[PDB]
Swiss-Prot record:
Cofactor note: Binds 1 FAD per subunit.
Pathway where this protein functions: Bacterial outer membrane biogenesis; LPS O-antigen biosynthesis
UniProt-annotated binding residues for FAD: S12, D31, Q32, N39, H58, I59, F213, R337, L344, D345, M346, D347, V348, T349
Binding site for UDP-alpha-D-galactose: N82, F145, T150, W154, Y179, N264, R274, Y308, Y343
Protein name per Swiss-Prot or TrEMBL: UDP-galactopyranose mutase
Cofactors required: FAD
One Gene Ontology cellular component annotation held by this UniProt entry: cytosol
Stretch forming the signal peptide: 1-21
Gene Ontology molecular function terms on file: flavin adenine dinucleotide binding; UDP-galactopyranose mutase activity
Recorded phenotype for the gene knockout or disruption: Abolishes lipopolysaccharide (LPS) biosynthesis.
Amino acid sequence: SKKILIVGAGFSGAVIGRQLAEKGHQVHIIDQRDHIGGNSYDARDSETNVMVHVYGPHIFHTDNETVWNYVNKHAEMMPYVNRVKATVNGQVFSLPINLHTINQFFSKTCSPDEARALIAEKGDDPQTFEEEALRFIGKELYEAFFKGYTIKQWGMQPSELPASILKRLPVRFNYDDNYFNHKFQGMPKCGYTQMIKSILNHENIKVDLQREFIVEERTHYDHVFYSGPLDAFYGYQYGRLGYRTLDFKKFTYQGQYQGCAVMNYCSVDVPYTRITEHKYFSPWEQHDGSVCYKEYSRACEENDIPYYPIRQMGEMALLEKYLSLAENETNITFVGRLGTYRYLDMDVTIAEALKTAEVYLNSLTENQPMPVFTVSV
Ligand SMILES: Cc1cc2nc3c(=O)[nH]c(=O)nc-3n(C[C@H](O)[C@H](O)[C@H](O)COP(=O)(O)OP(=O)(O)OC[C@H]3O[C@@H](n4cnc5c(N)ncnc54)[C@H](O)[C@@H]3O)c2cc1C
């Protein structure tokens, strides 16, 4: 029976914790926040009865059946297919770019094959160096849907990012407006917080909230699983890792503010990146009042929640410093979106957390040392 400290009550910590707890280990899970869930956390607005996704829209989607089966054990999963609109050029469009977006954009009536001909004769360019340089789609579409969105979202010009990150033509030549191509797509009936609470619901798990990790503690345990920022663990001794932060400005509207869950504003002339109307993530509930967030993207200064990691040369170079400090550590595994500096989806989080616990469990049945990283960086 091993004594485990987990730093974080998000999917990583909850899922590693419950796998271990079930093989009889004594798991202690701590979180600096006053609530479990991590960034997947949702709460019901008190004035409105609206399930608010507190750290932004969280839509569940996976091609992994084992991950799907696992979340259904812990929540009632509701069919929910996310559909995004975008406002730009004084018009409202379906996202991703599809047959309707094209026909509406160019005031046309193209069939799919006619639209393929349009996009080819609208594309521009020998050997492409920039993301700006992807005239897959041409100038009007790059500018409408891609340029101002990158500037607001990444605080960068698309001529500044590499040609990668846009591997394929970003258009779908039919009227399917599902945003996500994943096989399994749903929404927990009662939210992610109730889901993760269920996950944490084992006698071998003790949860302590409003509690920050303190390094000296590490010596009271057989192993630590750490889902906190990898640079923060080292006190940012080499400097902070590049992140974008988000500000959410909350407002309550009486009625329906926008008529969909998520509306993107592609233009630089709109300072928020998108508006989320949370009641739309629970279509099986009726709400008179509505909680909405205007979302603002910005450089992660000090005291900000890290959201989206910027991952270019400068950052990876700085990461490499922490990476070789860390690969020298003896009884710790860094896991999750922050412990590893990657953007991970919820389903990919749980996947990696089931595998992490499985690796650790194996390491005991055997002879063998538990690695500091369970996935490559
Ligand atoms: C804006 C945004 C929107 C997203 N929407 C989707 C979506 O629609 N679909 C999808 O699949 N995924 C979505 N995600 C991804 C999802 O949020 C992540 O997969 C999930 O947050 C991973 O959780 P985690 O357990 O690995 O880490 P986290 O959720 O960040 O949890 C880490 C926990 O560690 C705690 N912590 C950190 N350091 C310490 C410390 N030193 N001491 C104590 N506690 C500490 C924090 O308080 C936090 O609660 C989104 C991500 C972002 C940023």
